[PDB]
Design an enzyme around this catalytic site. Structure first.
Site, PDB file in Angstrom:
ATOM      1  N   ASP E  43       0.827  -1.193   0.000  1.00 31.20           N
ATOM      2  CA  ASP E  43       0.000   0.000   0.000  1.00 31.20           C
ATOM      3  C   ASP E  43       0.869   1.253   0.000  1.00 31.20           C
ATOM      4  O   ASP E  43       2.072   1.208   0.268  1.00 31.20           O
ATOM      5  CB  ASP E  43      -0.921   0.000   1.219  1.00 31.20           C
ATOM      6  CG  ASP E  43      -2.131   0.886   1.039  1.00 31.20           C
ATOM      7  OD1 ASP E  43      -2.174   1.645   0.050  1.00 31.20           O
ATOM      8  OD2 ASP E  43      -3.037   0.829   1.896  1.00 31.20           O
TER       9      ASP E  43
HETATM   10  C1  8Q1 Z   1      -0.940  12.831  18.419  1.00 31.77           C
HETATM   11  C2  8Q1 Z   1      -1.493  13.392  17.112  1.00 31.77           C
HETATM   12  C3  8Q1 Z   1      -2.764  12.673  16.664  1.00 31.77           C
HETATM   13  C4  8Q1 Z   1      -3.201  13.102  15.268  1.00 31.77           C
HETATM   14  C5  8Q1 Z   1      -4.448  12.367  14.782  1.00 31.77           C
HETATM   15  C6  8Q1 Z   1      -4.726  12.648  13.309  1.00 31.77           C
HETATM   16  C7  8Q1 Z   1      -6.114  12.194  12.863  1.00 31.77           C
HETATM   17  C8  8Q1 Z   1      -6.199  10.688  12.637  1.00 31.77           C
HETATM   18  C9  8Q1 Z   1      -7.469  10.295  11.886  1.00 31.77           C
HETATM   19  C10 8Q1 Z   1      -7.398  10.654  10.404  1.00 31.77           C
HETATM   20  C11 8Q1 Z   1      -8.734  10.449   9.695  1.00 31.77           C
HETATM   21  C12 8Q1 Z   1      -8.555  10.061   8.229  1.00 31.77           C
HETATM   22  O1  8Q1 Z   1      -8.073   9.017   7.952  1.00 31.77           O
HETATM   23  S1  8Q1 Z   1      -9.080  11.179   6.904  1.00 31.77           S
HETATM   24  C13 8Q1 Z   1      -9.458  10.188   5.431  1.00 31.77           C
HETATM   25  C14 8Q1 Z   1      -9.144  11.004   4.180  1.00 31.77           C
HETATM   26  N1  8Q1 Z   1      -9.863  10.502   3.023  1.00 31.77           N
HETATM   27  C15 8Q1 Z   1      -9.443   9.265   2.395  1.00 31.77           C
HETATM   28  O2  8Q1 Z   1      -8.518   8.666   2.826  1.00 31.77           O
HETATM   29  C16 8Q1 Z   1     -10.181   8.728   1.175  1.00 31.77           C
HETATM   30  C17 8Q1 Z   1      -9.355   7.906   0.194  1.00 31.77           C
HETATM   31  N2  8Q1 Z   1      -7.991   7.819   0.682  1.00 31.77           N
HETATM   32  C18 8Q1 Z   1      -6.897   7.652  -0.253  1.00 31.77           C
HETATM   33  O3  8Q1 Z   1      -7.122   7.595  -1.414  1.00 31.77           O
HETATM   34  C19 8Q1 Z   1      -5.456   7.565   0.248  1.00 31.77           C
HETATM   35  O4  8Q1 Z   1      -4.588   7.657  -0.845  1.00 31.77           O
HETATM   36  C20 8Q1 Z   1      -5.200   6.245   0.970  1.00 31.77           C
HETATM   37  C21 8Q1 Z   1      -6.113   5.152   0.422  1.00 31.77           C
HETATM   38  C22 8Q1 Z   1      -5.449   6.422   2.464  1.00 31.77           C
HETATM   39  C23 8Q1 Z   1      -3.754   5.825   0.735  1.00 31.77           C
HETATM   40  O5  8Q1 Z   1      -3.601   5.604  -0.636  1.00 31.77           O
HETATM   41  P1  8Q1 Z   1      -2.251   4.835  -1.176  1.00 31.77           P
HETATM   42  O6  8Q1 Z   1      -2.642   3.513  -1.788  1.00 31.77           O
HETATM   43  O7  8Q1 Z   1      -1.584   5.689  -2.225  1.00 31.77           O
HETATM   44  O8  8Q1 Z   1      -1.298   4.600  -0.030  1.00 31.77           O
END
Ligand code: 8Q1
Ligand code: CDL
Ligand code: CDL
Ligand code: PLX
Ligand code: PLX
Ligand code: PEE
Ligand code: PEE
Ligand code: PEE
Lengths: 64, 603, 32, 178, 88, 459, 103
Positions: E43
């Protein structure tokens, strides 16, 4: 819910928390393209003037 | 006859020879660092003799050899004072400098400009010696500026690093803020007591008014990094580790406290200045200890420890025990230089890593370093019958039983508890857990220079407190009888700090995660003091420097008033006068008008 | 080796003047 | 630093950068290795649960509260590598980097030492002198009309050709010159 | 400092050592020229994790714009060598 | 004194009959020889003066300024040797002639036992300077700068002539000895107020006072190097010397007529020190620093106490030497860079280490570091002003802090940091520039050993 | 994502040239050439030219020049206790009055 980060003059808004680049429209992409285009034009001019073996001086900067 | 003066001048003279030889051939070889180290060692072993003679008899002396210049009824001469303070602080500073130079011969072996580094160290040592032995306020000012300039030059050792230049300029800024008060005191003393010499100042001022003492206190606050002007000391760590180990740890930063000690005959006569300096010391020691509790850079933690100790001796000055403050200066030199040398050893062994998050199991990997650091930390926290004990225990005892402010009492007690706490934090996070450094283990301490330099300060921090405490005449009234609960307050509070810090640090093993509270953010960000105070004032001032002073006044209105108005008026008058069509009709009409005017007016 | 036009000029009310200045400072007209 | 940037960052790039920053700050918070691994796996789990979302409006709606949560718990004193733009030794050796052209000003007595190095230096200078004349023409004929659109330079295409504008990238002083 | 002058073969050995301890990929199948997205089916998040692992192991951190376009161990080795100015 | 004036005059025929390729050598050698002759004047006595004749007399105030004036000319020749390489022989000889005439006029000015002769030479010092500024200047603004420098000075100094002839008509003599011995109090009247203003404004405009300093940045920026050093080192001291000579007849009016000028100077020192912080130019920054120091000297002279006068003389000499050194260093940078901008060339310490050392020493001296005579004069003025009023210490300390800030900013921006990449004509520093800096700095560190030679007559 | 073929080729050629340049930076055995030209014991001489001579000079300067002028070197008078004897006079300071001594 989390407390909001209130920006000030001496502590500006972070790019990640900024909402301008999340409301994306085709004209915004066009604007970014033009910005990169003019920046690359300036960079190419500077690099052409910079690697010249014949030049033995200071590259005059119109901006400065 | 009386070799006291001869040797006390010869030590300061022999410290100068390598500076003269810096233009010779030996400066261009690799023998220069060893040459400087041997010179410093010889100077120390020579200056050890006046200490013995003072201990035997109680010898005191002032030497005014060269008469610089006479201004009417004032005489300025190159005068050295060789009292108890000077004769006792010469050997300690020389010993610490010798150990630091021997350590630097190993730490800075890869620096191409190592000879220049040693020359700068020697110049700083000479200037500090001048400051310590000075007898009149002008020579003291010479040393005061010289140490600051050397600190500026050594903080920004790496010119490429922008943060180094920023820290150097910040240190200069704060030291000049202190110099404002220093110059105020100098001017007041000359204009009222008619002398910059310490003798006449002491004699003519039976009841010293508030202004000169407030100026001296401001200078001491500026150079000793008190609460108002603290951040420059923690920020001064951008320099090489030996510099922060010698300059900004134990020798240069005690200059303000030493200035306050030197003027103790005037301090006792005033009650408001004593209260103000006690309050300043209390607030600064608490603030820096609280900041050091949660710091993660090892050098930052030790710098904040230094600031806390500086505040503690300012508190000691406040309760009118200057000799105890001098003793604490002497002990703190030893063990704080130890701690910085150990930190530098760890940093070099871990490939220039300073964050304690990446130091793991070094109790077994580096046995001599961990034993030295443990001894130094135990001495710092006040373990009985160690070097730090003979000073800190008496400090706390005298502070507990004086007609002083109660809030200062509470702040000092919390400060020493937090001192124990952050010592525990250093030890636990850098020597106990599992290793966290990169896989390529490059641990190595088997270098005679580092081992010898550490072991000398080890013997010092073990025995020097006892030796000095029992080998000097008494100068303070003992606190013979004390309540048992108050007799042990230092030990009880230190043990409580140890237990609390250890229990709270052991909770980081538990597999639970929680966002930080407001108190943690306040303590980690240094009370938000470096942020606001380095963005709100500066900006505004700089803004004015371009808006009001430069453009609006100089380039706009000052130009509009004198030159531009004159130019405009003369241009308009020239246009009016010279615009004649050349018709003689108008000319002769004007001639008739002026003939009539002169005929009827001037008669 | 810089022409008079390159140098900074007085604030211009007109759009055409504004466009000329934005091009002079090497930036987009609506970004100026 | 090497690669030229694009006019904008795609949603995937933003998500990846946020993931990297979140993992770094979580490691900073969780000092020990086992705790870091446990909570990193938990964060990966909570990060991939919205991997397969299709609509872009909701995905852009996400990664906003994610950024706010990251900013709230960002460990105000994160771990920075010593050579990073925030590290303790960021620009430590930038005062030792002396440019190559300085060697053209050396006295002949100084050039008497190291003769072979200066011979190779003359060879490199001749190589650059010819290569520049070739590169200026190659870049002139390769760029599209109206000026370049991105700051990416083409490689060398012929046999004896060299990449355009190579002299000041090849002759960097060193990482640690002294 | 006393830091040994790390060489290309040492860098490649370290890279393969780090990769072979990543149990998501089998040590036998991997090669110095093997890809990540296609030849190993990893991935994008997985690739970010490998990049961070090499970051931690080598003591220097890779910028995102350069880290997101490294897909083979050979080009990772080449990038590290270019960063650290390795002759051979 | 003629043993000094005559050789300076003979320098002109010596220069004009020299060979085309040996003018610089002869001029430098004989200028240095003249300086040695001028050294004899320094041995002043605690009594009145060295009254040579009816026309020239020397004091312990005139001796340091005279020695500095005679010493400056060789340095001016070595500085001008650089940019006059492509100049014809006649124009180079004319340049040296202008420099020699300037030195001769200054030498005749500083003794000038009679006030009208002093005024005549004090205005005569204006023609060679204007010719130098407007002829051998690079920028196109040298003409406006010359006009400003001429008119600002002349407008202030024209009422001085009327005041002097009026004083001669009433008092009966303008000889300074008679003026000092027969001095009488000035009553508080409008006529006496305007006499005070006329006698003071002519010297306050040249110092310069804050609010009338607009000519100084222009004159210092557009002038060539030699004009810059002669302006910053000696020509600024004419106003202060005249003011300290002429305040002997303005008492006791000054006791309350000094308030506007004291306030203006004590606020303009802060204003110009702040201005120095936000500056895009080096020569402008040094010029504003000179304005700040001269404002401090104005305060010292207007206080009118012995410590004030001693500090004023010490600061005069120290600031002259320091400003000359700083202008030299800026010119050496500008010759290689050809831009004259502070942030265009950076990190020059990696490329030119010895010039970095000279920069550091000059900045430290400008920073008023002990025990240099800069701080001696500074501290004397501080103590005198503190005796005048206890609140001046706030302004003086603020000025000291800002001075340190902008001095180290000037050092750091041009010396520290990473070198600019697109500059590859930073040739190694010649022996001429290093010798120039050494000859600038060594007299300062030597005078710090014998301060009484520069502390004035009230020592 | 990933390298474009043009980027790969350019990076490969740049890497080759950089490695060639870096290899050319090495110094051969005869590369550094210096033209020669000339015109307990260590500590024993060190203590003589660095310690003894300054002691001699400073002692001379203080004994015969600094002390020649009055009040240049002033020493705090030594503490006098009951029972000591003064060298200059020979008189004996009277003792205390025998305070009561218990514990
Ligand atoms: C201590 C600090 C804490 C911080 C916390 C931060 C917040 C954590 C929670 C985050 C919430 C989310 O995931 S926000 C979610 C954002 N939206 C999406 O992920 C939709 C589709 N995602 C993609 O297409 C990406 O490319 C992906 C498949 C992930 C990779 O692809 P690869 O195949 O190219 O690796
Ligand atoms: C401490 C006293 C020492 C006495 C020993 C005798 C020394 C005589 C020096 C006389 C003046 C020096 C001449 C100036 C130019 C230097 C020439 C040069 O280019 O150097 C290259 C040369 C060769 O190096 P290089 O590798 O070829 O060049 C590479 C680069 O140059 C890279 O260069 P770098 O990185 O090596 O740095 C160059 C170096 C050298 O450059 C300098 O900055 C030197 C100038 C420093 C003064 C700054 C101005 C402040 C005003 C002070 C005025 C005092 C003068 C007294 C009389 C002087 C007589 C001439 O700069 C510094 O190290 C920083 C100096 C800051 C010191 C701050 C402390 C000042 C006050 C201290 C007390 C003074 C009074 C004491 C009273 C009480 C005690 C008795 O190096 C040297 O020669 C160094 C000389 C030693 C430094 C002296 C600094 C302090 C001494 C000041 C005067 C002594 C007072 C008398 C006390 C005696 C007891
Ligand atoms: C006569 C009877 C004698 C007996 C007396 C009593 C005996 C002992 C009683 C115990 C008393 C307290 C002991 C526990 C200490 C607290 C430790 C703790 O719980 O921390 C966790 C907790 C938060 O930790 P976290 O965020 O979860 O940590 C994240 C990870 O753990 C990240 O962790 P990490 O690995 O990064 O680092 C952990 C680090 C980080 O920990 C921290 O965050 C540092 C903050 C704790 C320092 C507070 C200690 C002393 C406070 C002095 C305050 C001075 C006045 C300031 C006034 C401010 C006004 C706004 O913590 C430590 O390393 C050790 C902490 C220090 C413990 C050792 C020394 C404490 C004992 C000395 C205090 C009392 C004994 C005095 C002895 C003398 C006899 C009188 O701390 C707190 O909740 C704060 C508790 C106290 C704060 C008081 C200030 C509240 C002000 C609110 C507003 C009030 C109104 C103002 C109006 C103004 C109008 C103008
Ligand atoms: C070991 C010794 C150490 C100390 C050495 C000190 C040497 C000092 C040399 C420097 C002297 C500075 C110049 C002094 C000039 C002022 C005095 C001068 O004007 O006096 C004149 C006299 O000057 C001398 O005759 C000539 C001195 C000029 C030369 C000085 C020595 C160095 C010259 C170097 C020149 C170049 C040397 C060669 C280079 C190639 C006229 O005197 P006069 O007004 O009638 O006297 C009346 C009183 N009487 C009757 C009692 C005499
Ligand atoms: C701009 C850059 C700086 C330029 C130079 C600035 C310095 C020039 C300022 C002049 C100094 C003071 C001038 C007059 C001082 C006398 C005191 C007087 O002003 O105060 C009152 C005087 O009252 C009024 O001020 C009368 C004068 C009012 C008219 C003068 C103009 C005021 C504003 C003009 C400012 C313009 C300055 C710049 C011109 C280009 C006291 O009243 P009184 O005790 O009864 O009379 C005292 C005099 N006696 C004793 C001889 C009789
Ligand atoms: C050195 C090599 C030669 C060694 C053999 C000679 C040994 C000493 C013999 C010389 C005789 C002593 C001597 O030099 O004469 C005294 C002579 C001064 O003469 P006085 O009359 O006493 O005072 C001046 C007013 N007339 O003293 C000296 O100059 C030598 C010692 C002075 C101290 C050394 C200089 C250190 C300070 C440098 C200046 C620093 C700035 C000023 C400090 C500020 C103080 C507020
Ligand atoms: C009673 C009346 C008193 C008159 C006092 C005379 C003051 C002497 C200065 C007069 C100069 C006026 C000339 C003038 O400004 O002309 C406008 C002129 C146009 O430039 P030109 O070269 O002439 O034309 C080229 C383009 N076609 O504007 C300028 O450029 C001005 C440049 C130089 C200005 C110098 C001003 C300096 C004066 C400072 C104050 C002194 C004022 C004297 C009185 C003091 C007050 C009591
Ligand atoms: C950089 C530009 C600076 C410009 C400076 C110009 C202002 C200088 C100050 C005024 C100059 C004129 C003063 C006159 C010269 C003094 C002569 C004198 O003192 O004689 C007086 C005469 O006094 C006068 O005549 C003064 C008249 C002034 C007329 C000209 C006015 C010029 C401008 C006045 C205001 C300027 C003051 C502030 C200037 C600040 C700088 C801009 C005595 O009169 P008696 O006849 O002897 O009476 C005795 C019997 N009862």
């Amino acid at each position: 819910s989390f407390p909001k980060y209130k920006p000030s003059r001496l502590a500006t808004l972070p790019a990640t928390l900024d909402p301008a680049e999340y409301d994306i429209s085709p004209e915004t992409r066009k604007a970014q393209a033009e910005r990169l285009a003019i920046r690359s034009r300036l960079k190419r001019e500077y690099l052409l003037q910079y690697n010249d073996p014949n030049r033995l001086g200071v590259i005059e900067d119109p901006a400065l | 006859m009386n070799p006291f003066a001869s040797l006390t001048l010869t030590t300061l003279t022999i410290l100068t020879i390598p500076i003269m030889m810096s233009n010779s051939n030996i400066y261009k070889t690799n023998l220069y660092p060893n040459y400087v180290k041997t010179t410093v060692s010889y100077a120390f072993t020579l200056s050890l003799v006046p200490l013995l003679m003072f201990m035997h008899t109680g010898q005191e002396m002032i030497i005014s050899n060269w008469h610089w210049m006479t201004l009417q009824t004032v005489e300025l001469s190159l005068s050295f004072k060789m009292d108890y303070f000077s004769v006792m602080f010469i050997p300690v500073a020389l010993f610490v400098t010798w150990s630091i130079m021997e350590f630097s011969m190993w730490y800075m072996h890869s620096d191409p400009f190592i000879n220049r580094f040693f020359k700068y160290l020697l110049l700083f040592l000479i200037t500090m010696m001048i400051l310590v032995t000075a007898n009149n306020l002008f020579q003291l000012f010479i040393g005061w500026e010289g140490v600051g300039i050397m600190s500026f030059l050594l903080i920004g050792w790496w010119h490429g690093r922008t943060d180094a230049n920023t820290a150097a300029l910040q240190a200069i800024l704060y030291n000049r803020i202190g110099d404002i008060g220093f110059v105020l005191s100098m001017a007041w003393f000359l204009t009222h007591s008619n002398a910059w010499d310490l003798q006449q100042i002491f004699m003519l001022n039976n009841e010293c008014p508030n202004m000169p003492l407030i100026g001296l206190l401001l200078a001491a606050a500026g150079k000793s990094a008190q609460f108002g002007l603290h951040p420059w000391l923690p920020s001064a760590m951008e320099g090489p580790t030996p510099v922060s180990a010698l300059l900004h740890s134990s020798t240069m930063v005690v200059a303000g406290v030493f200035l306050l000690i030197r003027f103790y005959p005037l301090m006792e006569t005033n009650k408001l200045v004593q209260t103000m300096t006690l309050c300043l010391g209390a607030i600064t020691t608490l603030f820096t200890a609280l900041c050091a509790i949660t710091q993660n850079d090892i050098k930052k933690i030790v710098a904040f420890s230094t600031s806390s100790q500086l505040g503690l001796m300012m508190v000691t000055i406040g309760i009118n025990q200057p000799h105890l403050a001098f003793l604490h200066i002497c002990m703190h030199a030893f063990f704080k230089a130890m701690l910085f040398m150990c930190s530098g050893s760890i940093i070099h062994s871990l490939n220039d890593e300073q964050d304690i998050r990446k130091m793991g199991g070094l109790y077994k990997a580096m046995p001599f370093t961990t034993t030295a650091l443990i001894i130094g930390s135990l001495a710092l926290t006040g373990m009985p019958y160690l070097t730090g004990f003979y000073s800190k225990d008496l400090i706390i005892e005298a502070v507990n039983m004086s007609y002083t402010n109660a809030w200062a009492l509470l702040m000092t007690l919390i400060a020493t508890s937090l001192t124990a706490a952050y010592s525990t934090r250093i030890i636990f996070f850098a020597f106990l857990g599992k290793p966290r450094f990169p896989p390529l283990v490059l641990i190595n301490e088997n270098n005679p220079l580092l081992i010898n330099s550490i072991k000398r300060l080890l013997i010092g921090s073990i025995f020097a407190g006892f030796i000095i405490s029992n080998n000097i005449p008494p100068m303070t009234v003992p606190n013979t009888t004390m309540p048992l609960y108050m007799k042990m307050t230092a030990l009880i509070v230190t043990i409580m700090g140890f237990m609390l810090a250890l229990e709270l640090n052991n909770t980081t093993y538990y597999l639970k995660f929680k966002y930080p509270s407001q108190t943690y953010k306040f303590s980690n960000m240094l009370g938000y003091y470096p942020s606001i105070m380095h963005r709100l004032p500066t900006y505004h001032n700089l803004s004015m420097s371009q808006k009001s002073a430069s453009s609006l006044l100089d380039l706009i209105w000052l130009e509009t008033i004198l030159p531009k108005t004159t130019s405009f008026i003369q241009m308009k008058m020239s246009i009016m006068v010279s615009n004649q069509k050349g018709l003689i009709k108008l000319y002769f009409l004007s001639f008739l008008i002026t003939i009539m005017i002169s005929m009827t007016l001037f008669n | 080796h810089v022409t008079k036009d390159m140098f900074p000029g007085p604030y211009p009310k007109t759009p055409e003047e504004r466009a000329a200045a934005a091009k002079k400072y090497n930036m987009r007209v609506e970004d100026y | 630093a090497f690669s030229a940037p694009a006019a904008y960052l795609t949603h995937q790039q933003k998500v990846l950068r946020l993931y990297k920053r979140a993992l770094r700050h979580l490691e900073s918070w969780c000092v020990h290795r086992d705790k870091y691994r446990y909570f990193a796996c938990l964060m990966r789990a909570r990060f991939d649960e919205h991997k397969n979302e299709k609509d872009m409006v909701k995905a852009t709606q996400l990664l906003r509260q994610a950024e706010e949560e990251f900013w709230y718990g960002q460990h105000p004193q994160p771990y920075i590598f010593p050579e990073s733009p925030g590290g303790t030794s960021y620009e430590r050796y930038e005062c030792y980097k002396v440019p190559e052209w300085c060697l053209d000003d050396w006295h002949p007595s100084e050039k008497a030492m190291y003769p072979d190095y200066f011979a190779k230096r003359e060879q490199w200078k001749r190589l650059r002198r010819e290569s520049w004349e070739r590169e200026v023409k190659q870049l002139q004929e390769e760029t599209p009309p109206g000026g370049p659109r991105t700051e990416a330079l083409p490689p060398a295409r012929k046999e004896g050709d060299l990449p355009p504008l190579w002299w000041h990238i090849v002759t960097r002083p060193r990482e640690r010159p002294m | 400092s006393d830091a040994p002058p790390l060489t290309l073969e040492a860098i490649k050995d370290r890279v393969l050592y780090v990769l072979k301890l990543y149990d998501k990929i089998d040590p036998e199948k991997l090669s110095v020229n093997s890809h990540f997205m296609k030849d190993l089916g990893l991935d994008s998040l997985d690739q970010v994790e490998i990049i961070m692992a090499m970051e931690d192991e080598f003591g220097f951190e890779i910028p995102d714009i350069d880290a997101e376009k490294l897909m083979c161990p050979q080009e990772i080795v080449d990038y590290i060598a270019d960063k650290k100015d390795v002759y051979e | 004194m003629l043993k000094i004036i005559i050789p300076t005059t003979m320098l002109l025929p010596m220069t004009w009959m020299s060979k085309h390729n040996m003018i610089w050598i002869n001029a430098t050698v004989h200028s240095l020889l003249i300086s040695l002759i001028s050294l004899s004047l320094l041995n002043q006595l605690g009594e009145n003066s060295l009254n040579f004749s009816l026309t020239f007399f020397s004091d312990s105030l005139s001796a340091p300024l005279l020695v500095l004036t005679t010493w400056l000319l060789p340095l001016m020749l070595m500085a001008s040797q650089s940019h006059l390489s492509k100049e014809t022989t006649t124009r180079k000889k004319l340049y040296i002639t202008m420099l020699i005439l300037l030195q001769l006029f200054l030498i005749m000015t500083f003794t000038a036992t009679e006030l009208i002769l002093f005024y005549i030479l004090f205005e005569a010092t204006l023609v060679p300077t204007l010719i130098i500024i407007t002829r051998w200047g690079n920028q196109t603004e040298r003409l406006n700068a010359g006009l400003y420098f001429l008119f600002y000075t002349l407008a202030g100094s024209l009422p001085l002539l009327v005041a002097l002839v009026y004083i001669q008509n009433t008092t009966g003599s303008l000889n300074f000895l008679i003026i000092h011995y027969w001095s009488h109090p000035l009553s508080n009247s409008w006529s006496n107020i305007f006499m005070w203003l006329a006698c003071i404004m002519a010297f306050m405009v040249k110092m310069p006072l804050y609010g009338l300093h607009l000519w100084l940045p222009k004159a210092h920026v557009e002038a060539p190097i030699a004009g810059s050093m002669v302006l910053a080192a000696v020509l600024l001291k004419l106003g202060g010397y005249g003011m300290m000579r002429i305040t002997t007849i303005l008492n006791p009016l000054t006791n309350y007529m000094a308030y506007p000028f004291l306030m203006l100077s004590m606020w303009g020192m802060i204003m110009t020190s702040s201005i120095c912080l936000r500056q895009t130019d080096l020569k402008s920054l040094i010029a504003y620093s000179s304005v700040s120091h001269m404002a401090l000297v104005i305060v010292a002279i207007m206080i009118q106490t012995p410590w004030s006068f001693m500090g004023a003389t010490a600061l005069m000499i120290a600031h002259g030497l320091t400003s000359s050194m700083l202008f030299c260093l800026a010119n050496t940078n500008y010759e290689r860079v050809h831009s004259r901008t502070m942030i265009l060339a950076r990190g020059l310490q990696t490329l030119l280490p010895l010039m970095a050392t000279w920069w550091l020493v000059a900045s430290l001296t400008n920073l008023a570091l002990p025990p240099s005579i800069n701080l001696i004069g500074e501290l004397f003025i501080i103590t005198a002003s503190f005796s005048w009023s206890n609140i001046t210490i706030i302004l003086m300390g603020m000025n000291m802090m800002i001075t340190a800030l902008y001095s180290l900013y000037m050092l750091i921006t041009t010396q520290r940091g990473k070198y600019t990449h697109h500059i590859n004509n930073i040739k190694p520093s010649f022996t001429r520039e290093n010798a120039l800096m050494a000859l600038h700095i060594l007299p300062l560190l030597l005078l710090t050993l014998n301060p009484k030679m520069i502390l004035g007559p009230l020592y | 994502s990933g390298y474009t073929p043009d980027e790969k080729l350019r990076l490969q050629q740049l890497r080759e040239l950089r490695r060639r340049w870096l290899k050319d930076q090495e110094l051969s055995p005869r590369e550094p050439v210096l033209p020669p030209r000339r015109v307990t014991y260590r500590h024993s001489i060190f203590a003589v030219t660095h310690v003894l001579i300054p002691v001699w000079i400073i002692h001379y300067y203080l004994k015969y020049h600094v002390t020649a002028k009055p009040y240049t070197v002033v020493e705090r008078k030594p503490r006098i206790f009951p029972g000591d004897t003064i060298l200059e006079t020979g008189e004996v300071i009277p003792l205390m009055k025998e305070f009561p001594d218990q514990h």
